[PDB]
Design a protein around this ligand. Structure first.
Ligand SMILES: N#Cc1c(Cl)ncnc1Nc1ccc2c(c1)CC(=O)N2
Ligand SMILES: N#Cc1c(Cl)ncnc1Nc1ccc2c(c1)CC(=O)N2
Ligand SMILES: [Cl-]
Ligand SMILES: [Cl-]
Ligand SMILES: [Cl-]
Ligand SMILES: [Cl-]
Lengths: 4, 124, 124, 4
């Protein structure tokens, strides 16, 4: 999971 | 927005759509390319090809279970492009590049046409 | 093999599948969550959820146009997860995390359940 | 395009  | 994103999600969805295709699960159209037949999902075809997007948004053609491609289309070229649609992987070879490029032009798959043009230009 | 790969292909396919969903194009099922209804593509649902994969591979349920979820399922939680399926983006917030986690457990979406557990543990 |  990432900060897009 | 303040969303988080799962990096591998799109790739995992495509892998599962390909698994469904291989098992012939919820496939809703057969693409006929001369003597050959290819089962697929209309939504995947539309999502990858300008030609299929046009065909399946047509009020009559959207309901067809069989689509016959132009007789000039090469079945192997179509097969390579259908695999690319479901995998992101293009089996581009010296022996198939002309057929793949012609099929991608017909199917309106601009990125494939682009790499075929570039690979051809490098060999001349 | 000796394939080349188009990095953005899977993301572009998913973007187009979401565009078709927004325009209600070739959607083949309606998911009913108490008073709310959500139109979708069975193949996308199966590709994202262990529960939908089970439902639509069932020889009778594969043919249903309407699927009613358990009354305990929160419509907003379902909406957030349906958006995630079609975009890879999860709108996870303090006010919806419990509903999102419960819905992801029911839908069998392990990666969503994992990030919800991690975000909850960080707040305790 | 890349070599996967
Ligand atoms: N399905 C869908 C779809 C939608 Cl909804 N919106 C916009 N394009 C869509 N698909 C589509 C249209 C044109 C082309 C491609 C895909 C690849 C390419 O080279 N040309
Ligand atoms: N469509 C399809 C499909 C296929 Cl073909 N093979 C394998 N899994 C499939 N989908 C599916 C099954 C289980 C789970 C998910 C997706 C996400 C998750 O957390 N559990
Ligand atoms: Cl027909
Ligand atoms: Cl393309
Ligand atoms: Cl029904
Ligand atoms: Cl997930």
């Amino acid at each position: 999971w990432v900060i897009p | 927005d303040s969303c988080i994103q799962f990096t591998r999600h799109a790739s995992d969805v495509l892998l599962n759509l390909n698994r469904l295709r291989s098992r012939d699960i919820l496939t809703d159209v057969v693409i006929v390319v001369s003597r050959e037949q290819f089962r697929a999902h209309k939504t995947v075809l539309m999502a990858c090809s300008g030609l299929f997007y046009s065909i399946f948004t047509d009020q009559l053609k959207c309901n067809l279970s069989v689509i016959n491609l132009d007789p000039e289309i090469n079945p192997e070229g179509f097969c390579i492009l259908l695999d690319f649609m479901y995998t992101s992987r293009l089996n581009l070879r010296e022996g198939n590049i002309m057929a793949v490029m012609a099929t991608a032009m017909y199917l309106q798959m601009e990125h494939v046409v682009d790499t075929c043009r570039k690979f051809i230009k490098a060999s001349e």
